[PDB]
Amino acid sequence: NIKPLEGVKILDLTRVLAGPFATMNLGDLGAEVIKVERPGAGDDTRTWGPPFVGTESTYYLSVNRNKKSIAVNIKDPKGVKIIKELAAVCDVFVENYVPGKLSAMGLGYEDIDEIAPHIIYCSITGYGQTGPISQRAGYDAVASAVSGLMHITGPENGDPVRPGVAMTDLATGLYAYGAIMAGLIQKYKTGKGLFIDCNLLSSQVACLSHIAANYLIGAAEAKRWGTAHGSIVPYQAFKTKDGYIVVGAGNNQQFATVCKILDLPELIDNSKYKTNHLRVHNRKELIKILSERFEEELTSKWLYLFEGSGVPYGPINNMKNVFAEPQVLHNGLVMEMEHPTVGKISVPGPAVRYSKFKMSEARPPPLLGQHTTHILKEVLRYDDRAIGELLSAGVVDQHETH
Template sequence: MKGALEGIRIIDISRVLAGPFCSMILGDLGAEVIKIEHYKTGDETRGWGPPFVSGESAYYLCANRNKQSITLNLKSEEGKEIFRRLVSTGDVVVQNFKAGTLDKMGLGYEHLKELNPSLIFASITGFGATGPYKDLPGYDYIIQAMSGLMSITGERDGSPLKVGVAIADVLTGLYTCIGILSALQHRNRTGEGQEIDISLLDCQVSSLVNVASNYLCSGATPERMGNQHPNIVPYQVFSAKDGDLVVAVGNDEQFKRFTAALGRPELAEMDEFLHNQNRLEAKEKLVSICGELLSHKTKKEWKVLLDDAGIPNGPINSIKEMFEDPQIHAREMVVELEHPLIRDLKMTGSPIKLSKTPVQIRLHPPLYGEHTESILEQIGYHPDEIIHLKQNKVI
């Protein structure tokens, strides 16, 4: 069955996470992705570990399936010529060099669009192509700090905390993918390619959603609230008899059903808890009452009671518990791939469920330079030329 993006060729010269995550999604959707790696070291994440599985980094594996790998020395003239040939056959370039780096090498968008006017050129940088920080390197951790995200993450009286995954990179990969799909649609209508300028900082600021809006509307600086919600009560972590769970009571009707499930329906009739605004004003008292009541049953017992009452809730799972959840398996969020080195390689599945063009995991995360020779042959290089390129450290 054909993928939604079959026939689209992605030339991916990005490394680490944001760019590779974006190109992996495009590959999952059916695009052909050619991953260009440094001719000596490859993608940095190949060395990030442990854990390693049969010599392959788990970090690298997470964002690089459905791709082919070619090694290339982009500082050599012959390497640049190979890149230009690939671009002339491609639809999209994804790159995350520092702003202006490829321009200095003669490989920026203005140079490449002369070869391929319909080219879509997606540039991912820490701070974007404009502004006083445009020349600075951007790392997820730094972006989480500068975007304000860390200032609102953590306990009220504790230190600022980063999110447990590189969330700025992940969000940037998603935004870049949206930009590429939009540019492809524009090209379908007009035949025109274009450049896409994506910044990690911009993406993380955009993703502050209601927290940013609260500040812009009120002028009040949002603060860390731990596991509580700034606008809704009760909406937080509580401790059951055997562990923690989250309860998210979103409106007054849910609060009535919640108090009934707790065995204290009269709470919903009390003036101090009648509406969400009242509950916000009486937060400490209400949270204390709810916490005491919830501590008498197990997570599973509360899951049944609260589900039956239609109250959004869920246990705080470990990663192990999450992967053992039957819902995860029902949604095919764990997939097994064949790999030349790793037996029964498991990866997270795709969350994109398309009825007509379903995601297909066609290719394992490639070994370093696994497809160099076959790709060069596709674009017209003779075996003798490939030997020459190897001897001259071009590939």
């Protein structure tokens, strides 16, 4: 009934994806997310379209549910005053500007910690708070290139490729969303806050893990394999009559299973393919033989023949197949929300499910400045007199829809 983060206020100055994705997941867990946006423009994702639904872009809608919106010009001293007043009654402070940018505006950790020594201050940057290239802005495609992910992603004999989605941004967001709750836990015993440094470079290098460990320990360089792997064969995507199927065999018994299903038992006892080490050594000839067979049948036929095989196998699905998959719908991944002016909209739902509470009901993504007046009056106790003055000056903006 009650979510674990209920009663936790998050002062959210994040933009784009990495930061907003972190605060969206905390909003799913019950946190009161107060999104601070530029009057007029707002979060950059608001203008990235088409596709557009009414006035809201699908980019913005996808990662900003379960948030409230206050449009405040934080470059204005009156806006800085509002941010500091909000931080004093908030538990978490999140931003993803270049290091020192918020500090130059009077909203750095030193400034905020002075008036909110309890606060958890989390900064999401491209390369960290300090260092030779720490002043560069963070970008997923740039980080995945510098961190080594792109070099190991792509066709074996082709150009490097990027993940279809900004996995480096999302991974960093997941690091931060966990780190913020670790800060809260630490705060619960000590009563004081701390500063958290998340960045795209650190997140992606850490995710290299064993691949990077192979070099740091064995001086082994990594390479691109397309859909295959360097140390285990066969294990890749195979072109079928109408699509692709991923199939793998991690040992001689799985390899026998695959060959029998493919009606190629003669390969099991062939001297070239009897062990995994030999299959890797003879991978080009083996994959060619297997690929010729895979392409003769439809994907649906191969999926039926592999039922109960006990080997890793799965079809390569497009968006149409993904959301026709009964398992996808079963997991609640099609989250529907009622937008006040745009109507019913559907986005990918929460990835984690808990037994003691439900997250299937989410507040729709806020309109720009939708909750400006509500926050100033209810959260900061501003009177109608002061709010009208800030509105008249343009320091804050209130959407027509409340």
